[PDB]
Design a protein around this ligand. Structure first.
Ligand code: FDA
Ligand code: PRO
Ligand code: PRO
Ligand code: PRO
Ligand code: PRO
Ligand code: PRO
Ligand code: PRO
Lengths: 973, 60
C-alpha cells in the first residue's frame, strides 16, 4: 500500500518542461501519421447538422451569461406540457417585453417548478435584463431563433427532469436494449445532509437503471456511471478529513458494490486541486474493501493540467498493484483552470497547482497518456478529450493496439469520433450524457459554458472556419520551444500580484497535507492596567516624540513598516497562536488576519512614499515656486476592537505613524496581549520608543486619552455609541477641531434574486453571516430573498449552517469558535430569546458547553423588526416580491447604516440599479461580503457605519496629515 | 523655519495675501481650521464618500 499521497503542490513549470519537451519528440513517420489523422478528423468536424453549445454561442455572438440565460429559458419551455403553448410564448411574449420576468421565472423553475405558469405585456418596454439586452443587440426575431436552437440543444444533449426519477425515466432505453451512452450524473457539492442522501440515492437509482440495460458483454463494453465525492458529503474538505473518512467511505463503498453487482464502470470524477489528496484518501480506503475484488470497473479521473498528474498516476498504479486490482482510469485535461488560478492568487500560494500555458497542459496530457498506455493491462486508460490533435497523437502512441478507450460528452466530438471510427475500425469510445434534475442544471451549465466559450478551446476553434486547419495541428512542444517559457508570461505568481507597487503576504493551502500539518505544528509549538496618570504620561511622552518622528524622512518611516511586515510573516506562527488563544479565531481566520496585518504595513508604506515622500509642484507665474506637502498632525489616539486585535490594531497605528504622527494606542480590554506583541514588534522594526506608546485598560482610560487636550486626532473602530461620545468629548474641547476617523459596524444586507445560483447564495450567506461567529463588522445580518426561491435558499442555508463544526478554535476541524466573552454571549442570547418570541425561527443550532453561540436563522415579516447590529452568528431573512425591490432598498436605507451589501443576481441591470440607489461603502456582487483585502477592497462606509476614509485604500493616509504650501518669490535669482 | 512650524501657507520674500486658486492651496491647522485646503487637490474629496464595488466575474 502506498502512503497517503503528498506530492509538491506547485513545483516550477520550467523544470517540468525541461523533461517533457525533449521526450515529446516523435519520429517523422509518426508525426506524419498524426498530421494526417488529425487533418481527416478536423475535416469531418467541418463537414457540417446537429448543433452544439459552441455553435450557438458563435452563431449569435453570445457571452457565456447569455448562453446560460437562453438554455435555462429553453429548458423551462421544453417542460411546458403543450409544445404549441411554448411556440405561442416564443412568438408573442418572448422578446416583446417582460424581459427580467422571463429570465427570473425560467431560472426559478429549476428549483421551484410551480414558480412559472404561462401576465400581459404593454408595448414599448425598455429592453433590460440579459434577454432585453440581447433583444436590443440582435433584435427580438433573432432571440426567438436562438431560444429555439437552445431548446434543441437542451432536448438532444441533456437528460433532465424535475426529479432524478423523471430524468432516469426519460433516459431509459426500450425494454431489452442496452443504453447507448454512459451517465455523467449531474450533482456536485452537497450543501446539506439531505443533499448528500439525495445524491447518494440518485447514484444508486442511476446504477440500477443502467444496470438493467447493460447488455451481456464483459467490461470494458458495458455502461459506466460518473460520481463526485463532493456530492456525497456536505463538508468535503481537508480540514474535515476526519469525519469525511468515517462518513463518506462507507457511502462510496455501498455505491461501488452496487456498481460491481452489475459489472459497471464506476468512475470518481476529479474536482478542485485542494481536494486531490482528500479524494485519493477516500478512494484508497474504498478500494481497499475486499468486497470489491474480482471487479475491474472501479476507477477515477486524473487531470493532466495538474503538475501532480504524473505522480497521481504512479499512486493509483501502486494502489491497484497493492490490492491486486484492475482499474479503469480516465485522463482529462481539467475543468477548473480559472478556479485554480483565482484560488492560488487569493490564497497567496507560492505557485499554481496547474500549468498556466495551454500547450503545457497539452504536453503533459500526451506524456500522461503514454504513461497510462504502458501501465496496461492493470490500468485500462480512458482518454476523455474532444481535441482532434490530442486524439490523433494518443492513437499513434498506442501503435494500433486495444485495451484502452476514448471518451466524449454528448453533443461534443461526434463528428471527430465517427471519423476516427471510420478510419480505424478497432477504436472504442464511450459517450456520456449528463443526467440529473433541474436543481443541479445551473451549477453544471456554468462550468460547461466556460470550456465551450473559451477562446483557447479546441472544439470552438475547429468549428470556426476563420481558423485554418493547419493552425489546429501545431504540436504543443513547438508552441513552447524552450523550458523557461513554460509559465504564461502574463500571469504573475500570487506573490507578485501587486508588483512592483509592493510585495504580497504568503498564505497556506490547507488542501496540501504537508502545508496544513506544518502550520498546525508550528502554531502548537507556541498585564496591569494603566493608571490615569500613566495614560496622561503616555500622551506627554508621545507629544515629546512627535517633532522628531514627524521630521524623520518618509522613506525611513516606510522602511520601518516594511520591516514590521517582514517580522510579522516571519513570526506568523506566534501571532496566529495568539489570535487563536486570545482572539478565539479559527485557523483560517487567524492566518487571514496575520496576512492582512502585514498587508496593511506594506500598503501604507507604499502609499506613504507616494504621499509624504516628495512635494507636489503647483503651476503658477514665473519667478515663483509653489510646493504642496503633507506632514504629521501631532499625537493620534488609536482605539482598536477585540475582533481584529492585530490587523485593525496595526492598520490604524501604522497609518498614523506613516503619516508622521506619534501614537498612543489603547487596545480592546479583551485582547491586550496581542497588542503588546505588535507594539514590541513595531519598535523592533524601527518605530522609535518615543513615537509609539501602548496604554491598556477600561473605557474610562480610553475616555481619558480622547479627552486629553494635547492630542491631534482619534482613529477608532468599535461601536456607534462610543464613537459618538468620543466625538462629543472632542467637540467639547476649546482647542483645535481635530479629525475623528471612525468605523462603527453595520446592519448589512444581501439581496438575492431568482437568477442567482441557490447553492452559491447559500455558501456566501453561510460564510458572510457565521464565519468568525458573526464577529465581523462586515458580516451579513439581513438576507432579502425573492419569494419564488426563498424556501429552497433558506432551507439550504439552514442545512449548510447545521454542518458547521463549533468548538475549540485550535482543532483543525472547527468552523465556528467561541464568542469573545461571557458578556457578549449574554447579549447574543438575549437577542435570540427575543427573536424567538417575535419572528419565525428556521434554525437554532446546538452550541457546545462553554462560551459559544451557534448559528441562528430567523425570518422577519419586515426588515424593520431588526433594529440593532447584533455581533454574532445570527442571520435574519425577509422574503420579498420582485415588484417590491423598492421597498427592500428603502428598508436598507432606513437602518441608517452603510458598510457592506451583498448582491446575488445574474442580471447586470438589476445589479446596477441597486448600486446606483444605495450609498453603502462596500458592495459585493455574487460573492461573500467579508474578508476585504488591503489595497483591493478599500474598506469602510458611511452614515451610522462611520466617517471614512476607507482603510486599506488610497484616501486613508492623507486624513492623518495636514497640508502645507510653501511659496517662494524666486525672482531675486 | 519651514521645518519647525506647522503653518498652512508659508510665503517667502513676498506678501502673505491673495492666494491663487490651484497655485497656493489655502488653509491651515490648529485654531486656523480643519482643512482640507481650499483651491487645492484635496478639497473636493472631503465633500464625498467612497464606494468600492467588487464583482465576482468568474461566471463569465
Ligand atoms: C467523458 C468526459 C469526462 C470528464 C471530462 C471530459 C469528458 C469528455 N472533463 C472535462 C475535461 O477536463 C476538459 O475540461 C474538457 O474535456 C475539454 O478539454 P479537451 O481535451 O476536450 O479540449 P481542449 O483541448 O480545448 O483543452 C481544453 C483544456 O485545456 C486546459 N487549458 C486551457 N487553457 C489553459 C492554460 N492557459 N493553461 C493550462 N491549461 C489550460 C484546460 O484544462 C481546458 O479544459 C473532466 N474534467 C475534470 O476536471 N474532472 C473530470 O472528472 C472530468 N470528466
Ligand atoms: O469547496 C470546498 O472545498 C468547501 C467545502 C464546503 C464549502 N467549501
Ligand atoms: O463594533 C465592535 O467591535 C463592538 C463589538 C460588539 C459591539 N460593538
Ligand atoms: O472585511 C472584513 O470582514 C473585516 C471587517 C472589518 C474589515 N475587515
Ligand atoms: O484631513 C484631511 O482630510 C486633509 C486633506 C489633505 C491632508 N489632510
Ligand atoms: O489669500 C487671501 O488673502 C484670502 C484669505 C482667505 C483666502 N483668500
Ligand atoms: O472625508 C474624506 O477625507 C473622504 C476620503 C475620500 C472621500 N472623502
Amino acid at each position: 500500500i502506498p502512503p497517503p499521497f503528498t506530492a509538491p503542490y506547485a513545483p516550477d513549470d520550467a523544470e517540468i518542461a525541461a523533461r517533457l519537451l525533449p521526450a515529446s519528440h516523435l519520429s517523422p513517420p509518426q508525426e506524419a501519421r498524426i498530421h494526417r489523422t488529425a487533418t481527416r478528423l478536423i475535416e469531418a468536424i467541418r463537414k457540417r447538422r446537429l448543433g452544439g453549445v459552441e455553435d450557438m454561442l458563435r452563431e449569435f455572438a453570445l457571452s457565456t451569461k447569455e448562453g446560460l440565460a437562453l438554455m435555462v429559458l429553453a429548458e423551462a419551455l421544453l417542460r411546458v406540457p403543450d409544445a404549441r403553448t411554448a411556440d405561442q410564448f416564443i412568438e408573442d411574449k418572448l422578446g416583446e417585453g417582460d424581459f427580467i420576468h422571463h429570465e427570473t421565472k425560467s431560472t426559478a423553475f429549476l428549483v421551484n417548478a410551480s414558480a412559472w405558469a404561462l401576465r400581459v405585456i404593454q408595448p414599448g418596454e425598455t429592453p433590460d435584463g440579459t434577454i432585453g439586452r440581447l433583444v436590443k443587440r440582435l433584435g427580438a426575431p433573432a432571440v426567438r431563433t436562438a431560444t429555439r436552437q437552445a431548446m434543441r440543444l437542451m432536448g438532444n444533449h441533456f437528460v433532465l427532469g424535475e426529479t432524478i426519477e423523471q430524468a432516469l425515466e426519460r433516459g431509459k432505453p426500450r425494454s431489452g436494449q442496452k443504453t447507448r451512452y454512459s451517465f455523467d450524473m449531474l450533482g456536485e457539492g452537497a450543501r446539506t445532509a439531505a443533499d448528500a442522501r439525495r445524491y447518494f440515492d440518485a447514484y444508486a437509482s442511476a446504477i440500477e437503471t443502467i444496470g438493467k440495460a447493460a447488455g451481456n458483454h464483459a467490461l470494458p463494453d458495458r455502461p459506466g456511471i460518473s460520481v463526485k465525492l463532493s456530492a456525497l458529503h456536505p463538508r468535503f474538505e481537508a480540514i474535515s478529513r476526519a469525519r469525511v473518512m468515517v462518513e463518506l467511505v462507507p457511502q462510496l463503498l455501498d455505491l461501488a458494490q452496487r456498481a460491481k453487482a452489475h459489472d459497471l464502470n464506476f468512475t470518481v470524477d476529479a474536482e478542485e486541486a485542494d481536494r486531490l489528496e482528500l479524494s485519493l484518501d477516500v478512494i484508497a480506503a474504498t478500494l481497499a474493501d475486499p468486497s470489491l475484488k474480482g471487479w475491474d470497473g472501479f476507477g477515477l479521473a486524473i487531470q493532466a493540467y495538474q503538475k501532480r498528474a504524473s505522480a497521481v498516476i504512479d499512486y493509483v498504479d501502486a494502489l491497484a498493484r497493492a490490492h491486486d486490482r484492475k482499474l479503469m482510469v480516465r485522463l482529462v485535461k481539467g475543468a477548473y483552470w480559472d478556479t485554480e488560478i483565482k484560488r492560488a492568487q487569493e490564497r497567496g500560494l507560492d505557485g499554481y497547482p496547474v500549468f498556466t500555458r495551454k500547450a503545457m497542459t497539452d504536453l503533459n496530457y500526451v506524456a500522461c497518456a503514454s504513461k497510462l498506455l504502458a501501465l496496461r493491462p492493470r490500468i485500462f486508460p480512458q482518454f476523455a478529450t474532444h481535441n482532434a490533435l490530442t486524439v490523433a497523437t494518443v492513437l499513434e502512441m498506442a501503435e494500433g493496439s486495444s485495451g484502452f478507450e476514448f471518451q466524449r460528452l454528448h453533443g461534443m466530438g461526434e463528428a471527430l469520433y465517427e471519423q476516427l471510427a471510420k478510419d480505424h475500425a478497432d477504436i472504442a469510445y464511450r459517450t456520456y450524457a449528463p443526467v440529473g434534475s433541474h436543481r443541479d442544471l445551473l451549477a453544471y451549465l456554468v462550468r460547461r459554458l466556460l470550456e465551450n466559450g473559451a477562446n483557447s478551446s479546441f472544439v470552438a476553434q475547429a468549428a470556426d472556419y476563420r481558423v485554418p486547419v493547419p493552425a489546429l495541428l501545431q504540436r504543443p512542444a513547438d508552441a513552447i520551444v524552450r523550458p523557461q517559457a513554460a509559465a504564461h508570461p502574463r500571469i504573475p505568481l500570487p506573490c507578485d500580484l501587486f508588483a512592483p507597487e509592493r510585495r504580497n503576504s504568503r498564505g497556506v493551502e490547507f488542501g496540501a497535507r504537508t502545508a496544513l500539518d506544518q502550520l498546525l505544528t508550528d502554531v502548537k509549538a507556541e498585564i496591569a492596567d494603566a493608571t490615569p496618570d500613566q495614560a496622561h504620561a503616555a500622551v506627554a511622552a508621545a507629544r515629546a516624540g512627535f517633532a522628531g518622528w514627524s521630521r524623520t524622512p518618509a522613506g525611513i518611516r516606510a522602511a520601518a513598516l516594511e520591516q514590521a511586515a517582514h517580522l510579522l510573516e516571519s513570526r506568523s506562527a506566534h501571532f496566529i497562536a495568539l489570535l487563536q488563544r486570545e482572539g478565539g479565531k479559527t485557523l483560517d481566520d487567524a492566518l487571514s488576519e496575520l496576512r492582512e496585518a502585514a498587508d496593511f504595513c506594506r500598503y501604507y508604506a507604499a502609499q506613504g512614499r507616494k504621499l509624504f515622500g516628495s512635494e507636489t509642484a503647483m503651476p503658477g507665474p514665473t519667478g515663483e515656486s509653489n510646493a504642496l506637502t503633507m506632514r504629521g498632525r501631532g499625537v493620534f489616539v488609536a482605539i482598536s476592537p477585540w475582533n481584529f486585535p492585530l490587523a485593525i490594531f496595526l492598520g490604524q497605528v501604522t497609518a498614523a505613524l506613516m503619516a508622521g504622527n506619534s501614537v498612543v494606542a489603547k487596545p480592546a480590554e479583551q485582547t491586550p496581549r496581542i497588542a503588546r506583541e505588535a507594539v514590541a514588534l513595531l519598535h523592533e522594526a524601527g518605530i522609535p520608543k518615543s513615537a509609539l506608546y501602548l496604554v491598556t485598560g477600561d473605557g474610562r482610560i480610553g475616555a481619558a486619552l480622547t479627552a486629553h487636550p494635547d492630542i491631534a486626532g482619534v482613529v477608532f473602530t468599535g461601536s456607534t455609541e462610543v464613537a459618538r461620545s468620543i466625538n462629543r468629548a472632542l467637540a467639547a474641547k476649546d482647542g483645535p477641531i481635530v479629525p475623528l476617523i471612525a468605523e462603527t459596524g453595520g446592519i448589512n444586507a444581501m439581496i438575492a434574486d431568482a437568477t442567482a445560483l441557490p447553492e452559491q447564495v447559500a455558501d456566501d450567506v453561510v460564510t458572510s453571516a457565521f464565519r468568525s461567529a458573526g464577529q465581523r463588522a462586515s458580516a451579513l445580518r439581513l438576507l432579502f430573498v425573492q419569494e419564488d426561491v426563498a424556501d429552497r435558499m433558506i432551507e439550504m442555508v439552514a442545512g449548510a449552517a447545521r454542518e458547521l463544526k463549533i468548538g475549540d478554535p485550535s482543532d483543525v476541524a472547527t468552523h465556528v469558535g467561541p464568542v469573545i466573552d461571557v458578556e457578549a454571549k449574554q447579549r447574543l442570547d438575549a437577542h435570540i430569546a427575543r427573536m424567538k418570541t417575535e419572528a419565525r425561527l428556521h434554525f437554532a443550532g446546538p452550541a457546545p458547553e462553554g462560551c459559544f453561540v451557534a448559528p441562528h436563522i430567523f425570518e422577519l415579516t419586515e426588515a424593520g423588526q431588526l433594529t440593532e447590529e447584533v455581533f454574532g452568528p445570527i442571520l435574519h431573512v425577509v422574503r420579498y416580491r420582485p415588484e417590491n425591490l423598492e421597498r427592500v432598498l428603502r428598508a436598507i436605507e432606513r437602518t441608517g447604516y452603510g458598510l457592506t451589501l451583498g448582491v446575488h443576481s445574474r442580471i447586470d441591470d438589476s445589479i446596477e440599479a441597486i448600486i446606483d440607489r444605495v450609498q453603502v461603502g462596500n458592495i459585493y456582487v455574487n460573492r461573500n461580503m467579508i474578508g476585504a483585502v488591503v489595497g483591493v477592497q478599500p474598506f469602510g462606509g458611511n452614515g451610522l457605519s462611520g466617517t471614512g476614509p476607507k482603510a486599506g485604500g488610497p484616501h486613508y493616509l492623507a486624513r492623518f496629515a495636514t497640508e502645507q504650501t510653501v511659496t517662494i518669490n524666486t525672482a531675486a535669482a
